[PDB]
Each structure stands twice: as C-alpha cells, then as structure tokens.
C-alpha cells in the first residue's frame, strides 16, 4: 500500500533527537555551545519544508460584549550548508476587522 | 526601569501603552517555562505541516494568556540566549501585538 | 442614524431635537465636505451643554474624525467661536453620557468664493478665546484680550515683569506669517505707561513643542516701539508656516505693554495649490507606503504632517545614502506642484532630499533639476517641527516618493504632505 | 437633572452602566431601564458599582476619563475616577484583567 508506507515515513521522522533537544536549549539560561550530529542535521534537513502559515479564529467575551480575533502563525526552517539548522516563529495577534484598541490587542494583564 | 515619575505625573493623563510598559517583568522561572512550551507546540505544529496533517489539537494548546506575557516582556527587553543560541523580540501597536524569535542549533 | 451627511451651498444643524433637550448615549458625527476652491464658514447660534469636559462635548476635526488635527472640544456654555477653514473638509462629532442633557446646540453653514492681508485680530478674526497668556496682574486692567492694536485701552502685563511670561494666539487652521507689528500703551486713566522695547517670536504647529526664531546662528531679538505713540512693524524675510504663534518680550523701558498686529496668508492661495489630504484624511491610510520601517509593526498614520504624534523612521536610522523611500498613490491622476516636509519627533530631521513619479506602477521618472548636469535636489527643513514648503514646475503623476539623501545626525525621519491641483 | 427620584430598595442585578450624578447618588442604566440609587453609608457607591464592574466593556470604559488612553481606572472612595498607577490594589480598577478568557472556534 502506498498511504501505508507513507505514514511509515511521516512516523520514521517523528521521534528524532532534534525535536527533543530543541525545546530545551531554547529555554536554559546558556547551553550555547550545544553539539547536533552531522547525520541528525541531515534527517532534519529531509522533513521540513521551508514555510508554513496558518490563520486560527478565537473569542473573547469581555462582560456583556464578545468580540473575535484572528492569530496569524508564521514559521520558517532551513538547514546551512554548513549542516547548522535553524528554525524561526512569528506570531501575531489581530482584530478580525481592523480596530485601534481592542481586548486582544490590549488586555492590560496584572502581573 | 521605567521613567515613573516622568509618565506617572498627572491622574488624568497617561502615555499610552503605559500599563504594558511599566507592568513588573515575570519571574524568570516562569518565563522559561512558558517558552518551552511555545517552542515545543510550534515545533511540533511545523513537522506535522510539512506532512500535510491537520495538527488541529495540537494548535488547540497555544495559551493566549502566556503569549501575550511574554510579548510584554520581550518588550520591555527582548532577550538573547548564550554564535548566540536564541533570539527573542516583542513588538506592539495599536491594531496588533506579535512575537518573533528563534532558535538555532550548530553543528559545532 | 444622526450621522447626517451634508454639502449645499447654505444649511443649518442642530442636535436632534431643537430647542428640545438632547437625547442620551449619542455618538453622533456630521461631516461638511467642500467643493474644490471653496470655503466653509460656520457659526453657531445657540449652545448649553452641561458640564477639558468629561461627561457631553462636541468635537470639532479639520478632517475625518480622529484622522485629521483636533481644532476643539467645546463644551458648557461659551459659544464655539465661528470659524473658517479652506482646508475643504470640516467635521464635527457630538458625545452624550447616559444621564443628563440640556439644550444642545445649533449653528448655520455658509461658502464663499501680496500676502500682506492682517489675519484680522483687528476685525474680530481672532475671536477673544483664541487670546491667552501667562498670568494677568492683580488688577485686571491690562488683561490679554484687549490686545487689538489700535485699541484705545491698556496693553497687556503679567503679574511680573520678566524674560518668562508670555502672550499665546491660537490659529486654529495652517497659516502663514510674513510680518508682526506693535504698539506700545500709555494709561487712558494714569498718563505714566508702559512700553516693550524688545521682544521674542516663538511658533508652533501643535503647542507641545516649539521652535524659537533665528537669524543666522543667533537667536533674534527685535527691537521695538521706542514710545507708545505710534506703530512700529517688522517684516520676516521669509514666511513662517504656523499654527500657535507666542510673543515673549524682552527687555522693557519701564514696565511690559503690548499692542500686536499679525499679517499674513493661506497656503491655499499660490495660484492653485491645495492639500491633496495627507492632513485631512482624504488619503486613506491603505495608500501610503515606505521602504523600510523601525518595526513589523508600522502604522502608516505617522506620516502625516500635523496629525501623527511621532514620524517616520527606516528600519536603521544611518541607512545607505539614497536608498530608503516614502510613497504615496494619490489615487487619481493629479497635478503635483509642491511638498511640505517636516521633521519628525529621538528628534531628527531630513535635510536634503529628492522626489519622483509615475502615472503608473513599475516606472519612475526623475523630478531633474532644469540644468541638464544633475537631477534636482531640494533642500528641506532645518529643525523637527516648523514644516518648510518646496515648489517646482508642473507635474502630472499619481505615483509619487521622496527618497532621502541627507539627515540630521539622529537619522532619517520624516513627516510629509504634497500640495496638488487641477 | 441627574435624579428627582429613588427607583429602588437593593441594588439592581446584572447592570451594565453607571454615572453618578451627585456627590451622593448614583444611577445604573440596567436592564428594565435606569435606575437611580443612594447608599446612606456613603462609602459603598464603591463596592456596589466594583461589584457591578465585570459588565463594562472597554470602551464605555473609555468614555470617562478618556485623556486615560484605554488605559486602566481607579475609583477614590469618594467615586471620582482617576487613571490607575501599576502600583494599585488590583482590586479598585476597571479595564484589568486578570487572565483573557478565551475559546478556540474552528475553520
Ligand atoms: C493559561 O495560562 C494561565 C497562566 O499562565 C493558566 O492559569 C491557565 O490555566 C492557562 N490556560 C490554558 C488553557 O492553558
Ligand atoms: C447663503 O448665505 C449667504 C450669507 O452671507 C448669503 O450671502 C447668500 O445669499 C445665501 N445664499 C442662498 C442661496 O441662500
Ligand atoms: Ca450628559
């Protein structure tokens, strides 16, 4: 079956190394001088296109009133010739139709 | 800090964004914690693309809360890893919010 | 709803229900939009609103509502002076709580249709809430408003003789000074008196913010009525654009007294100049762009010339000589005559810089200069708020950007409006 | 003016607006309409109206104040507003919050 060995293929991929290890170096203080295997950068370099973005819908209620706002995801990977690999987000929050201050544009958190 | 005795001045004017931009920083545990697992959930949400998958209770976990105190806090000073490892930003204007950062890994 | 709509050569309006109290939780807006080379003149005939007010006030924009510059919020019981404007579009808002409402408000609207006409502080042009100053003295005899030249009444003084203390006019609308002429005062009722000898002009556009005039590298001091019988005027080299004007004396024979006459002109009356309405809102915020900007986030309002409280900058404030660019699409074919560059508020400014145009996209042409050695290069401003008014030949275009070629050492940033016709 | 009346005997439920129009009175527009009410402990205006203040959406917020810049309100004990300092009890502010309720919705 086709579909079944390319789920096989979509599941090979899943578990690597990379996709462990990135979370955590990105949120230790340091750990600048982290050590990726040439091999890993390569099986990383085989499964990411260069692009994605994705528009999500969610509500908010403030009180009485509810009011509804678009999160835009933009994501990009790319490996160097040099086998280093790099991975970038971008995420923005907007009115649905575009507004001067809005809750989700302004929530005032207490913190 | 903030210039508070230059904004707090009067109790009937205020510079906007003044709240978000004189709000306290968060405890430094937290905001890694929150960063773990925004990278974690949009990692995951990339591959599954670069598949075709649908991911839809993947994307269902990203806590709008979380974001939206760490695009306040990379404000107020966007921060930078240990060649560094990690970039981090916010920015902020009157019809959006948005964070941008990144991590990268070295082959050495 | 309420938000009527209007353009007829004369009409009045009035709150809903007149002389009846006004409804509660209004929010209402009313535009007056000009036909081209018209002006508007509006008087109001009754106000009592109840009561920098909190509760109900009427706004008035030389624009579209939060877009364009806030003439007023009026409010209470003083009758918003009547006011005239060429700027061709005139809006007014009105705001009501959920609680209490009073008699409300109506007035009628009106049209009609060198550089030396006075602007009318004379002839009541300048109406007595456009008048204020520092402080009065303890007396009340030689308040602000009796400031008319040729009034036959004491000058004005403040509480102290001193270089601080200051009188303040409010233009409301963008207007031009060529020349500032005094008077001094004796008493009618005490034949001793008063006269400045010397004294300061400082100028703004918005009132937070000022520039004080120089001449060459020294700041000026005019000098003055020798005694207060007789006019003394002194002519500027070169017309200031302004909006809030301030004179400040400087040194007095014995004691303060002003008498003061302003002269001057609209910008609107070069031969065919008018706004194209960077200032006024009529270019929509979806037809500005630039190269590069400090942030994702842009907000192209900053462009603006009066109406943005902080400018334009590029993502890196020392970029490359000549690359970054500021563009506008004035949405129809038009003829360009001028710009008015400002700077922007860091506190920098552009101080050289060139322009281009198309009819249409993917091409440019070259504003050159008439010799044929090189393209033509304009000199802007020299300080960050006092616009400067830039004028060439005849160009039909509707594409049109300015690309920078010299800055303050703060970077480039800039605020800017283009003068167009037909 | 403001009142000429006294619509109520305990304060209305589930109201969505206030302005208090003498020192001592305070009126509500509330669902069946208006009411105007007065606390003889002339305190409480604070707590009625905090108790009340989960209903008031961002801009009607904004109206009062609005030099405020959308930014957060505090009330003195003796009612008027004044914008609020980051300092403040948490409790005496109006347009704070402290999460952003929130729902995903598919597309
Ligand atoms: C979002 O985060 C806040 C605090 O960070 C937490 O209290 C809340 O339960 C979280 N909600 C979700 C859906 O993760
Ligand atoms: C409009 O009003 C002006 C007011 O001076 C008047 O001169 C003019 O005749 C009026 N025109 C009409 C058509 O009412
Ligand atoms: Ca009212």
Known sequence: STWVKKVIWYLSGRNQTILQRMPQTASKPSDGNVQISVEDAKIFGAHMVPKQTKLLRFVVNDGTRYQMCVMKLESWAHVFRDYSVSF??????????????TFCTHPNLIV | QCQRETA?????????????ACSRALPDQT???????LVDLTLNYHYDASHGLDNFDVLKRINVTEVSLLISDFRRQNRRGGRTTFNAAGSLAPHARSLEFSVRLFAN | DCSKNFTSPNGTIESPGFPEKYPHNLDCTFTILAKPKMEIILQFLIFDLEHDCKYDWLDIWDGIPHVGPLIGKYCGTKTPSELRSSTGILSLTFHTDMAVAKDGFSARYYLVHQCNVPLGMESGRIANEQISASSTYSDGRWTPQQSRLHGDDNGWTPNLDSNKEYLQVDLRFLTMLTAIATQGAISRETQNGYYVKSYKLEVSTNGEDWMVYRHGKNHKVFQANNDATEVVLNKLHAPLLTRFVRIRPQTWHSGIALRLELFGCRVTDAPCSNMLGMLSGLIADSQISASSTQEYL????????????????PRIPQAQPGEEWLQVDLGTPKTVKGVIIQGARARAFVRKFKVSY????????????????????????MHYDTPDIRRFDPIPAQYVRVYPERWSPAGIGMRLEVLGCD | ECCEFINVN??????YDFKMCNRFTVALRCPDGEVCYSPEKTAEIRGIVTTMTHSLTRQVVHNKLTSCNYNPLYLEADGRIRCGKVNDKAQYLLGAAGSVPYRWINL
Request: proline share 8%.
């Open chain 1, 88 to 101: 970038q987000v971008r995420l923005t929050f907007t009115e649905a139709n575009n507004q001067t201050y």
């Open chain 2, 8 to 20: 707090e001045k009067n109790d009937y004017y205020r510079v906007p964004h003044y709240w978000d």
């Open chain 2, 31 to 37: 905001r890694y914690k929150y960063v773990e697992q």
């Open chain 3, 298 to 313: 842009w907000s192209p309002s900053a462009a603006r010339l009066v109406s943005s409280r902080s400018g334009w900058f």
């Open chain 3, 358 to 381: 198309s009819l249409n996209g993917k091409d440019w042409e070259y504003i050159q200069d008439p010799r044929t050695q090189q393209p033509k290069l304009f000199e802007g401003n």
């Open chain 4, 10 to 15: 305990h304060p209305p439920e589930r109201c």
